[PDB]
Amino acid sequence: PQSQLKLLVTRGKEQGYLTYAEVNDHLPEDIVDSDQIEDIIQMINDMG
């Protein structure tokens, strides 16, 4: 029924692209941080 973060990941991969806004809301209710994103765009960006 649940596990959150898959989901934004698995969708981000199949689309091949996600808007900077696409990840923000699709992120789990857990990490909301502003500087959180900074490195994780670099994470998703080397992979797709």
Added chain:
Amino acid sequence: RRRKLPATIILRALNYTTEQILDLFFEKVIFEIRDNKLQMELVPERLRGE
């Protein structure tokens, strides 16, 4: 630009129970159990596209 939220959640904050929201955004279909073995009210235009 904030995080996405399910629409209906705002209506609840306006003091609308689920029944009220359904009452707002959906028409009604009346199911009558008369004598026995279900009867239904029919608006003749409801049968379009089905």
